[model samples]
Target chain A: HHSGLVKMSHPSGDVEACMVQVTCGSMTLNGLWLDNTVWCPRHVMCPADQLSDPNYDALLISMTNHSFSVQKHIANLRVVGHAMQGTLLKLTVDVANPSTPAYTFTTVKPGAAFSVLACYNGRPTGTFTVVMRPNYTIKGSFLCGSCGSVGYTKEGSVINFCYMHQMELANGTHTGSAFDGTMYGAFMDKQVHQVQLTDKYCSVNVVAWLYAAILNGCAWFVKPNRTSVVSFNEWALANQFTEFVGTQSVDMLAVKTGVAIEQLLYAIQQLYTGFQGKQILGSTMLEDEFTPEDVNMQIMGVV
Target chain B: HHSGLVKMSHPSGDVEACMVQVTCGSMTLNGLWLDNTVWCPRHVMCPADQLSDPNYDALLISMTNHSFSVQKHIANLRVVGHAMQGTLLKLTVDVANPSTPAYTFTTVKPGAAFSVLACYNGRPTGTFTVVMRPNYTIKGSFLCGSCGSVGYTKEGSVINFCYMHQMELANGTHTGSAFDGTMYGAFMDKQVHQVQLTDKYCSVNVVAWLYAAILNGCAWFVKPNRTSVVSFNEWALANQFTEFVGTQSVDMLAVKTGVAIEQLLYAIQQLYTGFQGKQILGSTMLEDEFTPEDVNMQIMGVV
Candidate 1:
C-alpha cells in the first residue's frame, strides 16, 4: 500500500495532516515508499511547520481514556497507551465472550471507519459498520467504532456504553443513519475538511492523494462531467472515489467524545447517589423516578 | 398501576436505579396492589437511601428553563422549564398547521410514524403527530410525542422548534425514519432503555423520552412491562393499548410545552413593536443573519 497525506480535522480542535497508506481503485502503491512522504501541495509549496503536532499524543490518550468501548462479546476495551511500531494502539480490551479474560492488544491497533452502502428509509440491507476493533465488527460497541446513523448492541447492564443504544442515551443524539448522499456530508462534517481545508492522504502516497483529492473532486474545483448524475463511467479516466470505496478500503471518523460523555454520566451518577462514592455497582433492580438527570448531560452542564 | 423498581442508567453517568411502574401485559399489577410499594432489589435488600433524589428535580426544572419544543403545527419542539403540578412548561412553539395532521389512534405510536410511500432521494410521505397538551387535542404538541424519525410539520417560523425540520435543523441531526425493524432500534435507541427502563406507551414511547429524557418520560416510569414484540397481534385477550384515538382519557403531569412554544413567539412579538406597548411591539423585516445566537447556544458565547 502506498502512503499518502490526508488532512485530519478534530471536531473540537485543529487540523492535523497525517500519513494514510492504502491501496485502491487499481491504484497500488506496493513498492513505492520512496516519494510517499511528499503529497500535499502545502508540503511542496509552503512548508508551513507541515508535520503532525506533538499535542496529538495528549489528544490521543485523552481519546482512549474517555473513549474506550465496552463490548460484551469483546467485553471490555480501554486505550492503554500507544507504542512506536506500526503506530500501535495501546489498549486493554475484553477478549471473546467477555468477562472470560481481558486481552490487551498493543499491536493490533484498530481504526474507526465505515463502509459505504445505499441506505434508504434507514434500512441498509447490505450496509454495516467497518472497523479495526473486534477486528471488523458488526454492530460493535468499540469505544471508537465508526457507526453509521446508528449502532446496535444489547449486552445489557448499567455500566458500559461502548455499545449503540447506550451511546445515544448518553449523548442524546439521533442518527437514523444513511450512508448515501446525505451522511457523506455529515461524514465530512468531521472527517473531511469544511471547504476551508483538504484531504490528500499525501504522506502515504502522492498518487493515492491525487486520486482521492481529485477523484471525489469537489464542486468547487470540478464541475463534474455529468448529466445531473454521477456514474462510475461518467468521469474523465473514470477515476472516482466511489470507485475507490467500490475498490479506498473505505470510511466517517465520528467525533471522539469519551471525556465529555463520561463526565456527563459521572455527574449524573454522583448527583443521583447523593454524591455517594460508590458507582459501577451491579444492578438487578428497578429505579424510583425517571427524570432528566438520569440521562441528559445538558442538565449536568456542558452539553 | 403496580410500581416496580428498575435500574435506570444515565447514558452518560453511573447507573442510578429508579422506580418504574406501569399497567401493561398479562402481568398488570392491578389488584396485586397486594404490595405495589416495592420492586428494586436495592430498595428491598440493603435499602440504599431509596427514593428518587431531589437533585433530579433541580435538574428537571433546569431542563425546562433552557429547553422547550416550539410547534405551530410541526413548526417545532424542544423542552424547557418544568413544574411540580400542572408542570407548567415555558416554551416557544411555532404557529402554523404543520401539514395535514396525520393521525393514528393505536396505542402504538408508530413511526410508520410516517412514510413517504414515494419520498424519493429526499421526499417523505404521509404526516402525523399526537400530543398531550390541549389534551387529546390534535395540535397540542406532546413533549413525549412518538414522532417519526422525521416530523410532519411544515409550519414556517423563525422561532418555535417544537416542530420538525427546524427541530432537526436546530439539533443538526438527520432522521432517515421508518416504521420497520431497523427504526425500532432507532426508536429503541431512545424509547427503549438501552438497559431495562421501559415505556408501555413504548410504540410511540421513544419519541416521548427523546424529547423527554432528551425533552422528557415522566409520563411513563412511570409506565411499562413484558417482552412481546409490539405487534398488532401480541395481545392476551389483549386489552390492546392500540385501542387508541378513543376514550383513553390519558394524561401527563406537566404544563403542556406547545403553549410555551407559542408563548415564546408571543414574547418575540411583544418585543417587536406589534402590540400597543402592553404585550409590546412590531417590525417589518428579517434579521441580518440566521447564525446560532439566532440558532446555536454555542454561538451566543462567541458570536
Candidate 2:
C-alpha cells in the first residue's frame, strides 16, 4: 500500500486538518463525508427505497405455530458458479442478511453466471449478478454498505456514489473563487484511477477541488445489468453485508458461537457442491437459530 | 373524550399491542404507525433528521464563502391584527420557531385583514392569514414542526404530507395486495376527520379506513394572502408555533432578528386600532429577538 499525507486546507483560512490514508491505488476524500449523507448515514433507506428482496424460487413458504393470515419464509437455493478462465477473484460469495448481523460464505467455481436475483422485503425485487463472461467482460456489480454501489459499462450508463467526482469528471465549471477547483486535476484517471479504500477516512470536500477533473482518465470494467428478457428462476438471498464478517466468514463466526466450523463448512460446501439437503448452523443453518452474539461476537469483540 | 377498549387482533397470531389514547377525535391504530409516516407530521423526521441548528449557520455558510456563493438570510415580519367583531377565540397569537424549544404570546384586535405570513426554509414559503373580512368567516391556518408543511384552501389545493392519503386524496389506487388498501376503508372522513392526538399509540392501518371519510366534515376556515402587487412593503415575522413555544409567530421572529417589530407593529396598528407601539409580548414589541427558549422551553426544553 502506497502512503501519502493529504493536507485539507479551507479557502477562507478558517481552520484545517490533515487526513491520513494508506490506499491500494488512488484515494478519494469525497467518500469520507459522502457515506449515506453529508452528515448522517440512513442505512435502511436503500432497502426501504426498493422495499422488496431479490428474486427467489424453491421457497417453501411456512407460517409460525401460532398462525398468521399471510406467510413469509426462510429459503435456501443452490447456485452453480462458472468463472471465465482469465478472471482474478476468490471463489467465494458473501451474503449479508438483512436486519441481522451475520454472514454466509459459500464456495463457487471461478466464472459462471447463475440466476442470482436481488431479494428484499421478502421475495425477489431485482436480479443479482457478479459473473464475468468468457469474453473477459463482467456482468452485474456489487451493492456494498461501506463501498457505495457503483456499476457501469462502456454503454454510457453509470450508477455511482461519486457525486462530486462526477462534477470533476464532467469538468463543467467552478471558475470562481467561491468554488476552488484548483486541486481537482489530481483526481484525474491518471492519478486517482480506481477509488479503492479498504478502511480510511475520506476528505469529502476534496472533490470540490476537482469539480471539473478529467472524466475519461481511467479504464473501468463496470457492467450494466440490463436483461432485455429473462426469467426469475434464481433465488438471491438477503445480502445484508456483514462487514465484520459485512463477518469475513461463517467459519470464524461458527467458531465463536462454539459450533463445529469444520462440520459447518463441510455441510456448506456439501450443499453448494453436492446440492445436498440444507446446511446446519445451531439449527438448519437457519437465520433464526443463530444468535447475534454467537455470530458477531468475535468481530464485535464481546468475546 | 369517550374511550373504549380496542382489542388488536392479528390473523397470524404472532403477538399483541394494546394502544390507548385520549385524543381530539376517535382513535385509529393505523394512525399510530401512520402518523409517524403519513399525515403532515413528517415533523420529527426533519428535527430527528437534522438535529442541528441555525446558529451554526455561520460555520456552515463559511464553508461556501469567498466567491462562489449565494446569499440567504432568516427573515421576520409582524402584520397588524384585525379580527371581525363578535368573534370568540380567547384572542391570542402564538409563534413557534423550528429547531428551538419556546413560545411567545401576543394580543391582537378581535378582527380585520392582515398579511401574517408563514416563513420557512429562509424565505416566505407560505403565507399566514387570520382574518374576519367583516364576515367573521375565519381565514387562518396553522404551522406545525411535526406537520412539516401544510397549505390548503376552499378551492382545494393541498400541500399536505400523507403521501398515500394525498395519493388517495388525489384519487390514486393500489393494484396489488403487497400494497393492499385493506386498511384504506378505515379512513372515511366521518370516521377520522382531524388527525389529532393527545398521547397514545395509533393503529396505522386506520387510515385505509378513513381516507374517504366525510372528506368535508369539519368547518375549516382557510386563508389566502393575495397582495395587490406591493413592494418591500410586507415584512412577515417568524410565526414560531411554540407547540407551547414552536409559535407560528413569523412576525415576532422577523422583528426581533432585525428590521423593525416595535416600530412596524406600531405603524401596523395606527391603521387597525388607531393604536401605538407595544401590544403583546412587549408592546408593539415586534419580533422581540427570537431567543428560542423565549417561547418553547417546556416543549423545547432548557435549550
Candidate 3:
C-alpha cells in the first residue's frame, strides 16, 4: 500500500496543531506513487499487516480517521511565518462519507505571501491561510461536480459534505507525502519570487516622466489588463512602468494589480530583511534571494 | 524788457551755434511749454534789422511774416527713429509765395549726435540737440494747417514719429515725455523700470522638494516666489500665472529669458538704498500688499 501524510505543528504547545494522512488498500500505478515507479514500483501487493491484520490495520485506520475527523472538527487553524501574520486554515468535509469534501481558499493579509501544500495523489495543491478579525472575512470559489458554483462563508466556520468528488480525486491521485506545516514556508518563498518579478516589471522610466508631466496630472494608479497605446502614454505621463503598458496582450488592470502586489511584497521583503540583519539566519539562501544586484537591476530598469 | 544776451561754445567749428535773448511782452501763468516748441514767443515782437527797424512795431509785422514761415517750416519737417540707430531728418520748403516747393533740409553724416538751428523772423531761438542711439528713440506729432497735412515719417532713412494722440488714446495709455537729447537719461530709467516689472512678475514658488525636482527637472530652479500665496495648496495648482506663458506678457517670459529680472531689480534697489549685504528689498511694500491685517481679513470674511 502507498499512502500520503500531511502534518502541521505549532512551535508552542499551547497552540493547537493538526495532521492529515491518506492510505490506499491496493498499490496502483494511477495513484501518487506512479511518478516514482523506480523507487516504489506499480501494482504492488498490500502488506497483510497493513490491510488484513487487525492490530496493524486498526492502528493505521485509526490514525487516518483521527486526522480526517480533526479536519472536520476544527473551525479554523492559525499559522505564522516571516513577513506573514494571522494565517488561517479551514476545511469542508463530506458528512456522508466522513472523508472527502470540496475546499476553497484565500488569504487576508495585505503583503505578498501564498498558501500551498505538498504533493498528494500526483497533484500539488494546498489550502490558503485565512485570517479572522471582527467584521473582516475571507471568501473563495468552490468547484463541485458538473454544477460548479461559488459560495461565501465567513472565517471560523465549516461546511459538511460539500465536495466529495474533489477530495476523493485529490486523495486518490496522491503520489507522496501530503503537505506538512513546511508548506507554509514554501508558499512564502513562492510569494517572494512573485514580488521580485512584479517589481522588475513595473519600474518607471525617463520618457514616462516627461510624458506624464506634460500630458496628465502626474499621478498614476496601478491597474490590470490595461495594455493599450494610449494607456501607455498615460502611464508614462504618470511616471509608471511602461513595459506592461506597451504590451497589448497583457491585461492593463491585471498589470496594475500585480504592481500593487509587488509593492506589498517589497514591503514584506524590507521587513524580513531588516529582521535578518547582524546575525545569519538558518541559511544564506534567504539573503541570496534578496540580493543587492537583483534589487538594483530591477529598480534601475524600471525607474 | 528782460532780454539778456549769452554766449554758448561748441567743440566742432563746423557746427554753427547761436545764442539768442528774448523779452516777453507779458507775464505768463500756468503756461506749460508745448513739446518741440522751437521759437520763443518773443520772436513775434521784435523785428530783425535787415528786414525793418529793430522795434516792437517792426517786430510785430516781421513776427507775422516769421510766424507764417515758421508754420510752413514746421509742416515740412520730417523726423524718424530706427531701431538701434540715430534719428534721420528731412525738410521741405515753399519756394514760391503760394505753392512753389523746394527741399531745404540737407543730409548730414550719420553720427552719434547733431543739433538744429531754428530761425524765426531772422532771429535765433535756443539751440536744440538731437541724439541718435540704439537705447532710445523719441518721436512727436503735431498738426500744421499752413503746410498741408504733414507729420514725422518712418520710411527708408526717415524718422519714425509715434502719433502722440494715438499713443495716448491706445488701450493702455502711453504716458511719458518726448526723447530729446536731454531726456535720454530718463528714457533709460524707464527701460530699467520695464525690466524690473518684467522680472518681478516672473517669480515662482516651490511647494515641495519633490515637486520642485519634478517640475524643474532639477533642484537648481527651486527658488520661492516672495509674493506667493500663503496657502500654496491653492495657488500651486491654480492657474494664477498661466497668462505669462510667452512673450505676450512681461511677467510670463521674464524668467525664461534668463534675466531673472525681478531678483536683479531687487538687488539694484538694495544698492540704491545704500544698505549693506543681507538687507532685503520690497519686504515692507509687499507685506503691505498682502498682510493678514489688511487683505487676509477681507478674504476670510468672503471665503
Candidate 4:
C-alpha cells in the first residue's frame, strides 16, 4: 500500500540503501527498515480482491542474517479495536490455532520482571531479558545475533546483519500482558513528526536511541494490563483512560513506545478518520472486515 | 571534574573529534560535546580553596565561532536548591547585576507559547522561534546561522562549527517561569545510563533526536511554572511533586528535559548524598556556600 526509501546502518557502522514497504494482507510482504519516514508510493486496489478475504489481524515477521519476511493471519482486529479503546493491546500466538497470532487474554504483576523471547513465524528471532529495579527502573537487553543491518542495498555497499530488539513500556503498569510482541519497527518512523523528518540512515541507532530511553527508564513496557492500580474503573480513572483518546492517553502510549504524544495522537486520529472516510467504519462496517493493509496504511498515514 | 570523548557532526556532514568537559567553578570551563558519556578526570579539592571563595550560583557562557567560555557569578544555587525541589529552574540574564546570570523569578500562563533567544555572556549565541500548535504540539526552529559542529577534534578531522540550542519542557505547567535558561547540554549525557554507555560521536544527532521529540510533542517546555494547574498545592499534587524526590517528580523532570526519570533521580539523589557525604549539607553547614563546581560534580556523579 505504501513504500518509502530508507538507509540501514549496522553496529559496525556500515550503511546501506533499502525500501520500506508498508502493506497489509494475509499475503506475505517484504520487511522494511525500522524507522518510518517518507510515504510509500501510491497504488489503487479493490479491497474485495486485493485484501485478505477472511481478514488477518496478526502479522508474523522475521529479520535474520540481513533479510526480512512477513505474513498475516486472522486475530480479530475488529473486535479488539472497539473493546480495547484507551488501553494497550496484547499480542500472542494461539496454540490451538497455531498459524494465527491471537490476543492471549492475561494480566501481569505491577512492576515485575519478565522475559520475551521473540520469534518470527514460530522461528525464534532473539530473546530479551527484562529487569524492573527499584526507583522505577526498567532494563531490557537482547542477546542472540551479531547486531547488524537487515535487507539489501541494491547497488550500494553490503554490511553485517543487525538485530535490534526493543520492547515498548509506559508510565504505570497495566493488566494486559502480551504473550507475543508485534512487529513494531514499521510503526516507529510514523511517530516522527513532519517538522523533524529527515532522511533516516541508521536503523540500529534507532533502537539504540530507544535503548537509551529504556536504560534511563524514560520509556518502558508494562504489558497491556499490568500495574499497581486495581480493577478496571480505578485503573482507567488513575491512568485517565477517558472516553475520548485525549492527551493523557496519548502521553501514556507515547512514553511507552518512546514516540511523541503528538505523533501517536495524529496516527490514531488518522486511522479513526480514514476508516470513517472510506465508509469502512460505523454503520456500514459491521458485515465487512477491514484488512490489516488498510489498517496499516491508515496508521502509516500514507493513505 | 569529568571528561569524555565526543564526535561532532555538521549539517554538511563533516565529522570532528572533541572532548566533553564537565566541570564547575567560578572560572570558565571548556565546552564539550552535547552528549554526556564518560566521566571527566578526577581531582580532589577542598571546597574552601580550590572552589570559588564567595561561591557563584549561575554561569555566564559564550559559544560563538567554534569557541566556548563560561564564568560564574552569585545567583543563589544554595537558596534555589531547597526551594525549587521538584520543579524546573529558569535561567536568565540579569540586567541589574549585569555580569551574573539570574533566575528572574516569574510565572507563566498555562499552556502558552513562548520564545527563548539564547546568548552566551552578554553576546547572543542564537535565537529560537518556538510555537505551540494544536493537539499539545510544540515546535522550535533556529534562524541564526549555518547549523554545524561547535567543538574541535584534535589530531583528527576538522569540520564546521555548529550551534545546538534546545529548551526543556515538561507535561504539566508549574508556577515558576525562568527569565534565563541554563546551559543544559552538560547534564544531558549524564542522563545516559551505564548499561547503554558507548563511545560517543556525532553530537549533532543528539539534538536531532530531541528535535524529533519536540516535533512529536513527546517533550515540551512549559516555562517551569507556566501550566494549567493553579497554585502551588494543586500544581504539586497534579504533578505528583511529593517529598523525598520520588518517581512522579523524577518523571516530570525527565519528560521535561527529554531524559530518563531514573537518571534524573539518580542525579538528584547523588547530589543529596554527596552533599551530605562531603559534610556540605544539613547540620553545621549553614554559613558556607557550595561552589557551582561542587554542585556540578554531584550532578555529573564525578564525586
Candidate 5:
C-alpha cells in the first residue's frame, strides 16, 4: 500500500532501522515481509528465556496498511544474500505433506528491537529462491543460513557485492591532495590533499592504506598496502579495489560493480571522512546484531 | 687394563652392547667415564618412580680397570652433538664455586640396556667442548637437552651429520639391478637388479623412493619423487644423496663425506636391504629410547 523510508525507532536510538526503502503488496522485498508482518527466523528473533515472547519490537519496519493479515509457519531455510539493512534468508514452507511444494518467501535478520514481530505496510526491495520442505525449532539463539560470510556473488555474471550499510562520506573538502584515485592515501588525509577517505568503506584498499597510516602516524607514512573480521565478499571487494586508480567516475564505477548508485556514492563518501576517525565496515547490514550472545553473556557474568 | 670387544650379554641378547672398543686408564673416551664408572645424566638413566634406583644396568659400556675410584657429582649440563651410539651431552661440575670450572666430561645417551651406568675398559671414543656453571634436578621423565631434534650443524665447513646409529645394510646381493649409486632405487630391490637396498639406511633419498614403491606396489613406481619422523640431520643427509649417482668410489665417497668408513659402509648397506623390511633409522644412537614416557603413561592408563 505504501513505499517510503519507514523510521522504526529502537531503544538504542540507532537510525539504521529505517534505512531501507520498501514497497507493499504480497511483501515484494527480499526481506521476511508477508502480508502485513515481517519477522526474522524465530531463533534469532526471540531471547533464550522467552521463546514465545511475542516481542513486537522485533518487526522489520513500521506499517501503514492494516487490511493485510500476517502469517507465520515452520519452513526450511536457506541464506540468499545481504539486503540493504539485513541478511536475506529464504524460508520454504510446505502445506499438507512434507514436500507438497507449497509456500516460500524471502525472510531477513532481526533489525530493530521488536521490529521483526511487528506489522508493516509493504514488501521489501530484493527477491530470491524458494524450496519445498525441511527445517528447525532452533535451540540456539543465533542461526546462520548458507549465505554465510560470502559477501559477493557471481549470479549470471552480475557480481553483486553485499550492500554496505552505515556508510557515509564526509561533508566538506579536505586540505590534503586530491584523491588521484590511487589507493595510496585514499583513506588518510595526511597523504593526499582533499582525498576522499573513510574508515567505513567496504573495500580493502582503504583498509591497508588506513592501517599503515594509523600505525605509522602513531609510530611508514609512504602509502602502502591492509581488517575487522570482515566477510569474504567484503574482503574480496576491498582487495579488488586495491589496484583501483583514477580515470573512472563513481557513477560508472557503480554500474561496473553492479552496485546501486546510491550505495556506491555512499561508499565513495565514506572515503572522504578519513580525517574524522575510522570504524570497521560490515558488508552485511545485520552483522553487528549477530555477535554471539553467549559470549556477551559470559562477559556480563564475569563483570 | 684390557680393551677389546667385551661381549656384555643382555636379557634381550642384543650384541650392540659390546660394539665399541675402549681402554681403561682414566677412562679417556668422550663418554661419561670418570676413573672407571661411566653414566648418562640421571634424568635419562632412571625410571620415573625410581630416580634413586642406582640402576647399574644403565652403564655406558663394559669396564676393565678396578684400581681407579669412580667419581660422581652434581654439575651443569649442555648438549654437544650426536656420538656413534648416543647424544653427546657435556656435563660440568664445580667444587669450590659454581664458576670454578673444576671438572667436565662428554657424556652420551643410554644405548644398550644397563650400558650407560657400567664401567668401560678404557676411554670409549670422541671429544667435546667444556664449560662450567648452571643445571637441573629434573622432575619430568623424558628431559631433552639443548641438542633437541637438530640433526646437523655447520661448525665451520665440516658439515658433520649426526652419526648414523642402528643403520646397517643387507647381507648377500639383492636380485635387482646394480645400484648405479643412484638414489633412484637405492632403497628399492625391484627398481634396479642387484641394487643395494635397506629399510635401515639413515638417508631420505631411500625414504622417498621407498614410499612411492611401497604405496605403488600396494596401490606409482616410475622412480619419481618422497617418514618415520627422522631427525633434521638424517633428513638432510638423505636429501643430499637424492642426486647421488655413479662416478665416485664408495671409499673415496667416505673420505669426502667425513663419515667414519665403518659407519659409512653400514649406511650404504642399509640401502641394500629394502626388500627385507623397513626400520626407522635414527641419526643418533639413543633416539628410540627418548620417546615421551608421559605419553606412553597416558596411553597405558587408557589401555
Candidate 6:
C-alpha cells in the first residue's frame, strides 16, 4: 500500500519483526528502501526517518536613512529625499532558496525625510522606517558694504565705513584742491556723516560756487563780498601782509581797463583748461557737463 | 598850346596872331568817365527811353522768433532759434539779386507762442514749427483678475479683454464658474476695485483641489454638508449634461496628477484615459492591481 507517509522496516526475521511508521515517529529502515520504496508500518524490516529541519543564516546589511522596500520578496526597493529633487536609490538582495527563505527586520524612522531603497534576500519586504535626522543645511549671501554687491561673510564690525573710492586714497596726500583729493575727501566726509543735502542748497551754494566760476566766467574772479579791488587789497594788507596783494589783481584790473582784451581772453581760456583738468580727476564742479544731451551725443555719435 | 585843364580858340583870328581865351565859370562832371559806358542820370530816363525802373521785388525775411541765413546764391536759407536749444529755419530768396534784397522786420512779444518756417519760392526751405497746445490723453491697460496678467493699449478707453483660454460651457450654465470667463471677470473686477489677493491664489486653489483629490479620492464629494445620498446624487447631476466631464477631468486632472506622482511608486501603471458616454469614463479604476512585487514575480517566473 502506497501512502503519502514514509515507513521503515527491520531486516532480522527470527527476532521480533520491527516496522517503522512515518507519522512523526522514529524507526529503523533498510538503506535499500530509501531509494524508491515507501515503507509501511505493518511490514517488517521497514523503518521511518524524520525529515531534516530547515536552517537559516542571519542576513546582515548596512543602510542609511534613505532606504525603502515595496514588497515582501525583498525586491524593488527605492530611496528618495525632499531636498534631492531629481535623484533616486536602488537596492537588491540575493537568496539561496527558490521556495522559502528566512527574513530579518530593522528600520530607520520618519521615511519622508529621506530617500530609501531597502530589501531582504533580493525582494522588497516592509515599510522601511528611516531614522531621518534631517541634516538640512542652509547657505546664504549678503551684500558687501564695501563692494556694494553680494557674497560677503566677513565680520561686518571691521568693515571699513569709508567709501571704496575713499579707501583707495588711504596712502596719499588727500587734502589739496586737486579733484582726486579734495572732491573725494569731501564726498567721503559727506558720506560718513550721511549728509543728504537738499536740491535747493546744492543748487544755490555748492553747485553755484563750484560750477558758475567754470561755466559763466563772470563770477570767476568775484570776491566773496563783491567789493572793489582796492578794498580787497587793503583788507588783505590789514589782515596779513602787503605781499599777498602783489600782482594778484594787477592783470585782472588791466583787463578790466581794456588794456589788452586778448590777454584777458587768453587768461579765461587758461581757466577753462584748468577746469578741464579738474573734470578729468572726477570733480563735481563740471558735473553738469554730463547731462542727458552729452549722453545722447555720445550714443548717437557712435551710431 | 593846350593847358592841362582846358583849351579855348578865339572866334576871330587876329592877323597879329593874338590869342583870345573864353573861360566857363563852372563845369560839373558827376559820374561821367570812361568810354564804352552807358549812363542815364536823374530825370533823364523815361518809360519810352529806358527800362521801366527795373521792377524789383524783395522779401525782407525778418525773424520774429528765429535767425536765418541764405546760402548757395540765395537758393536756400537757414534759420536757427535763438534760445539755448531752439528750432532752426532756412529761407531762400527768389529775387535776381538776393544779396541786396529788401527786407521787413517784425518782433515777437515775450511769453507768447508762434509757428514759423523759412521758405524759398513758396516752398519750405527749412523745418516748420507748429505751435503745441496742451491736451489731455488717457492711458490704460486690460488686466485679467483671475489669471493676473496685463494687456497694454496704445490708445482708447475700452479694452477687449479676451480670455487667455477659450471656454465653451453648457447653454444653461453661467460663465462665472467657467475657467476662462472666471479668470477674465475676476481680473477685471479686481483691477476696478483695486483689491489684490495673494499672488497665486487661483493657481494654488486649483492645484490644491486637484492634488488633494488625487491623494484622497473625491474631495469635492466628501464635503461636511453633503451627508445624504440625495445630496450626492444631486451633486453628480448636471444641466446640459454631456459625456465631457470625464474627458475634461482626464485631460486636465489626470495628466496633472500623473505629473505630480511620476516619482512615486506605480507611476507607469497610472495611465490616463479620456471619458466615454458618462459612465465615469476611463479605464477600470482597479486596473493597477498588480503591485511592483507582482511585476517582479512575473519577470522571475519567466523562462
Native-referenced TM-scores of chain A, all candidate models: 0.19, 0.18, 0.18, 0.21, 0.19, 0.13
Lowest lDDT 10-residue stretch of candidate 1 chain A:
A8-17
- Candidate 1 residue lDDT tens string, B172-203: 12222221212211222221122221212222
List each candidate's DockQ score.
0.02, 0.01, 0.00, 0.02, 0.00, 0.01
In the range A1-303, model 3's lDDT, one tens digit per residue, is: 000000110011001111221223532211111111111111122343432222322333343322322111223111111111111112232222232223233322211111211122322111221111111111111121101011112222221111111111111110111112121111221111221111121222222221222121221222232334444445434432223222221123124323332332232233233433221212111121121111221222221
Which regions in candidate 1 have their CA more than 4 angstroms from the true location? Answer: A1-241, A244-303, B1-11, B14-23, B26-303
Better of 2 and 4 by TM-score: 4
Model 2, span A1-303: residue lDDT tens: 000011100010000000011111121111111111111011111122221331111111221212111112222211122111111101111222232211112222112222222222222112222221222122221111112111111111111111111111111111000011111222221212233212111111111111101011111111122211111111111221111111233334434344332333222222333323322211122121112222232122232
CA RMSD (A), model 5: 30.6
lDDT of model 1, residue A202: 12
- Greater TM-score among 4 and 5 belongs to 4
Specify the poorest-scoring 10-residue window by lDDT in model 6 chain B.
B1-10
Looking at model 3, give its docking quality level. incorrect
> Over 4 Å off in model 6, which ranges?
A1-189, A192-234, A237-303, B1-303
The RMSD of every model to the true structure, in order and in angstroms, is 27.3, 30.9, 40.3, 25.4, 30.6, 47.6
What overall lDDT goes with each candidate model? 0.19, 0.18, 0.21, 0.22, 0.21, 0.19
Show the lowest summed lDDT stretch of 10 residues, model 3 chain A: A1-10
Per-residue lDDT of candidate 4, residues A1-303 (tens digit)? 011111111111111112122232222221212122111111101133532231122211221111222122202211111111111211221212222111122222212223332222222222222222222222232111211112111111222221222222232111111212222222221112122111211211122222223323433221233222133224334432322222242333345455543332232223323333232111211111111122222122221
Local accuracy of candidate 3 as per-residue lDDT tens digits, B1-303: 000000111111011111122222321101001222222222223333321233333434333222322223113212121111111111122221232122122222111223222222222211222222222221111111100111122222223321111011111112122222122222221112232111121112111111212222222222433322333324323422211111122232233333332333333223334433221211111111111111111111110
